């Protein structure tokens, strides 16, 4: 598998591909990696299938008991904690996951999470199989000066990249960007197309 | 001589002490709310107190969920305790089930907690009542939670000091049905009707749901416009 | 002086405080039942209230499997608490079993929770009748259930307010195997005759089983035929 | 003012609450049996009920072996509950010896059991009185077990509000070894002359075990010859 | 052994074949790997025999009780959910099974669940030792706008090419559709014996 | 208005409790014993009831160990409870020091066992009181087992409601080292002038042990003889 | 002769027993604070005692945060075990979020365990009441916690016993956004106009935090101006 | 009406239930000792009972070491157990650190152990007072634990009935550092002169230890000497 | 009709069973102590007793540490469990952060177990007051710790019967940083005008710590010269 997570202005965008593989054996071609765990925020997965989606539900969970016993959104670094503490207490019978929770509070923020714990910030992430090619075009592309289209753009050029050179991924990338203004907003799959066909890496 | 222990019957066959939690509710100020053409409100009131006092943190309703929401009246700390097993329940349940599917077994759990303290003696019961109310796989719902555990799921009522005045207008005035501002104000207007005479109804807190959509809480001044 | 503790008997030899949980009872609304030609109903008054009740959450009747099914009077609190521990016993049961082969088991789990309660000081028994009814390897099943846990299994009887009035009724005109139709006729005019004068009926829930065949609730309008 | 707690004696030196649940065992129907010429029998008055009653479950006779068989008198909530208790300390005796050897300690763990409530404040005893009976390694064996847990094994007894008749009536007239149809014909010659004056003798659950088989329950018809 | 669950327009049809072992040495010709979970819902097994079993029984209690409690059946993202985190509380001395849930409650599913307790969404699932074959005869031939008989006649094809391709599976192939309108039907042998001998796969 | 709990003295200082169980210790039947030239005996009064009872199982005296034996006096029930922990905790000694070295030590666990349910409160004491006797490594043994817990080692005593008459006796008439018949006689005199006026002995069980030797329980005929 | 227990309501339906903890509050000394411009401060009266006190243990002020912060008045001794739990839950809230995000949960966490005690028997509750005040993600925040478990958050309160003249005169003289040191000598006022007559204000103890600011607490001499 | 409960006070502000234990204690034969030049006695005094006690169960003096040993007086089943405590909390103390350094600790656990039920309800004192002696790495020692507690090491005391009168003599009339012989004499005229009029004294037990000697028993011919 | 349960508060407001172990610590000898010129003491009265008393075991002041000291006056029962938790914390302190850093939470441990018992039904408190003293990183240290829980740190205090009058005396002669000689006999004078007439002061227990120092218990004869 692979996700990316990109850090920019005003802005925090995450997408992953939807193959899920299960066995060697491609299995499902249309999977769900991005989930919305709050109305600012979301978390990707790139980790064994059923222990990723147990800690989906839990911080789904207790972000909505958060919010709606204080009524304020839960800041990305109160995740990530709250997420290494839930990780660290089991590490001798751990969750073989690497999870990656993005989101913006007020200032936008990418937080990658091993299968012991470790967070860190950092201004653009990835985790999963096809993770060192994303990273490499992250690095070569990634400026920080860039607006949501262009960094939809590069997503779309990272997670192509890494579809083409990489087997466990695979399949229709679907993309989120989370900003202030508009929320959590996951765009439909024909807009992705056209930007697909727009920067002609379909064949 | 009865009216002592949680555990024991009167020889007319009451339980006293039950009886009596109920009359600590009755001391509690009066939250109404009905269910409409397509959602559930409620309505609770609210006799405003020092200015000191941040509006956050004295609202009768409560959001147990973006879908479920309450009023309760009377203790307030066994109030917010109840509140407190109503989100939980609602995160339990809406984890191993995926969503929280039907409103009347949160309910459920709410009442056998409320149910089995009316029991066991070394503990006395809760002294509230709580109105929920949301939107499920079925629709709108509306129930009431007293003391004892008695659930009856209703699309109107009221509880606290008023109630039997609120029910009583409700009971021969409202209709079903309304969209949303006319079942509002005629339940401002059986609001009204349960204070006594020289008070001013002063401005309460209502918020409503409609099918598909999440509560929103009517700010002061949208509810300043029903006065 | 003794009517206190559930664990003292008097100089006569009585248990005051599980008779009370008994009168407890007694503040229930009628609920009766029977069996016939290959099959068991069950018939419950509700004196309908509320119309903001939506019907779903006051049905005193409850389906405790697709083969077993319930009624219940007095404290609602106990007797919700009490549907459900039939539910958890008859699932146990089943699994143990691979299906549900006694219904007498089930209400021997059941009769045996509520027997305890009426044993330990610290604990107050459980103020609900329950009338078990259904079918199972052996055929029709109708048992009742009382707060001291005696289990003694009919082809007909009631529980709540009326009881006396209704069993009196079935003791004097009741024949078995009738035609369903028939049947569910004649326990309703035992449950007219347990109500007060000037009382009109309204319109109780009833449900039955036939050999072979699951539940069915009876909707208003089936009902309202034998009016 | 000491008959409250049952872990306080009088000052002649008595334990009123464990009389009083022997008072409570007085309550219920009287039920006999005796030991003959290779085995034992069992006699149970039953007052013929509500002809809804199925008569599978109200046999106050009940297998708690293939070879070890009891009745009951008292509060038939604790009767049950103690005649499962016999069930699983019989299992649980047949299992770690590969059989059940002794009846008498059987009714041994019936008896500590029943003994051990009679002692701990905040538990009543039960009040209920056991009359096992069975075929053992020894051969034909006939206990009773009170609520303070007494066993005396007999080759005659009763239990119930009749016993004292019965026993008075055994006491003067029983003669040991005699041919099962004899023996029985005398236990129902007991058992008649028991009740008061213008009752007449309903049909009673009769059912024995001879050296080597295993229980029959005489159906109401073969009971019906000795009418 | 062998599964198959296809969605279609306003149905959803699984079958698997009827050979347990247990052993290597097939010992049992006639089993039963397809149950009857729920009115409207359905769980085919493909796993140890015995943990399968145990959680078939434990399902159906589950949503029995639920039923009877609520007095509306289970959603089948619901039912997923409850089978994944029973797996998931479990992972350790885990049960070695491979479980397929599909049914109809608004719209039709079919979900599959590892070992681990992995739920994901799919058109078309399969698992069990001749998976790959079924695999791949629904990927040539399936199409989404099929009528309840031409799926029946997929499902029966792709269940016979397994049978003639794999040593594990084997026996008489059991098919039950279920749909919406007439609730959970189960077809008796002697219809498709007349769909063998229809589509000649017989000899 | 202090004889209420076990755990409140008088301002006397006794505890009304512990010696209201003494008293229900007096309303059992005498039983003596004493040890003589190499052995002790016991001696037990039963005052012969229904003739269905079987006697194996109405021997107050009963075998601890092929080594130690003992008898009881008082409520039967915590009386059978008493000699099975008696028997388990001379399994756990033999079993902790390869044999019953010491019967001391045995009366010590049973005597510490008697002792805490006099001392916590929701419990109440044991009702009996228990005579040990046997053979160790020492020789001749014979220890009495009061509610309280007092243990005093006697080469004589008795136990029960003649026990004042019965040690009044031997406090003027025994004579230690009798060779085994003589003593028995003495006691046989001892338990005769304890009855009150017009009873009439009847035949009382009556066991010994010599050293290096097991118990015998002289048969009835054997204790015709002394008559 | 209900005030007696914590677990029994009155007839009128009231909870003597947690009113009397009440009371037990109103025996300690006075404490206000209140809210301003950007931020909050504390005043704590204190009638300065025997000299040999080392002033550090007798802050009525205490720190639970760098940002939160709180005063009590009652039973000195459940004061400091309350202000000990506010602390390490002040611990377990920032690290299971990275920070004390809102104050009010800490709060509440105070109030939930001051709450519990109020109903069960077997404990009493806690006679004190604490006066929280600091800076979150919100800003300034004021809670005023009781013996019951009450929480409102207020802009300013006093507790102890001149509560009711504090809030007396802060409910018709204070005026919000005031700059921190015209705040503190309208506090300094309402303090001193709660004393008796001929009683000096001695030296009493203030602390206050701004936003993005620690605490800190005025030493004596910056306190010595406002005299 | 205070002197019920083990944890009530009165308003002179005392514990008469922990003093009616320390009356319990006065029940209680005479026993005595002190130290001399280099070593400790023991003299207790024993009414000779029924001869047939053999002498080796009735010893109020114990040997809880080679090195520590005590007696009692008062509840005979407390003493004994609080004698086996004292045994096991030596030898535990003699294995965590190697030997038995301080007898004082020995005693201390003893009195914790006794502290701790004159405090919690549900639980009675023990009645019973020790007297410690032994030898340890400081020299002669001699304790005395009474019901609530108190150690208070001395070079002579006695308990028991007698008390009183015995250190009324020694405090005129003891002095220190006597020859072992000297010694127990003078300890003999003490509990002579504790006696009623008319009373002999019978023979006492004594026992002593000395500086690098274990104890021993003086048998009751050396005893004899000193009558 | 309140001062019975520890848990019941007065109309008025009041723990009356928290107040009569304020009452049984007034009944226990006097004992003082301040701080001075770096460095604290502590001096308690004793009355002498039996000579035969090994002083090393009267001793009220004991030392907690090489560099913390306390002293009680009550329930010498009750105390001395509490000196060993003292002493007991002290160590927990020490190991997790290396050392005895502050004085004051030493206290705080004993107070909150102190504090605990004026709380829970079914447990009586301690009735001592404890004065602790000491040397930590801050300097002198000198607290004391009443039966409820209260710790209020001085730098001079009394405790026990005397206690008014001492704290009389310090409140109007005491001058701090004394030269150690000169503090002593102003707190000798100060324990002299506490006793009542006639009475002579004896030789009472003194000792002291200085900054950088450990303790050293002054003996009597250096005790002596203040006579």
Known sequence: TTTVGITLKDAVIMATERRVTMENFIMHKNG??????????????????????VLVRYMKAELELYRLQRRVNMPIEAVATLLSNMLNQVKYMPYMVQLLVGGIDTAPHV???????????????STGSGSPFVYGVLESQYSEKMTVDEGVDLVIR????????????????????????????QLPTDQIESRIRKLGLIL | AYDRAITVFSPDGRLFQVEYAREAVKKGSTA??????????????KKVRSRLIEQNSIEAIQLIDDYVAAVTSGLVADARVLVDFARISAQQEKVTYGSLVNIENLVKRVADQMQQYTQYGGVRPYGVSLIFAGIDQIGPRLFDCDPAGTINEYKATAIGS???????????????????????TLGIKALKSSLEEGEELKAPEIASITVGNKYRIYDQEEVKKFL
């Open chain 1, 32 to 53: 769900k990696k991005l989930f919305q765990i709050d109305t600012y925020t979301g978390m990707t997965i790139a980790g064994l299938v059923g222990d990723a989606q």
């Open chain 1, 111 to 125: 937080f990658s999470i091993d299968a012991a714990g470790g967070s860190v910030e950092d201004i653009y992430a």
């Open chain 1, 158 to 185: 990272a997670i192509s990249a890494a579809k083409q050179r990489d087997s466990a991924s695979g399949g229709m990338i679907d993309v989120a960007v989370i900003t202030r203004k508009d929320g959590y907003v």
């Open chain 2, 32 to 45: 109404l709310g009905m269910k409409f053409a397509n959602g559930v409100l409620l309505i609770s009131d």
């Open chain 2, 162 to 184: 008023g109630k039997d005045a609120v029910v009583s207008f409700l009971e021969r005035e409202y209709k079903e049905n309304l969209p949303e501002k006319e079942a509002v």
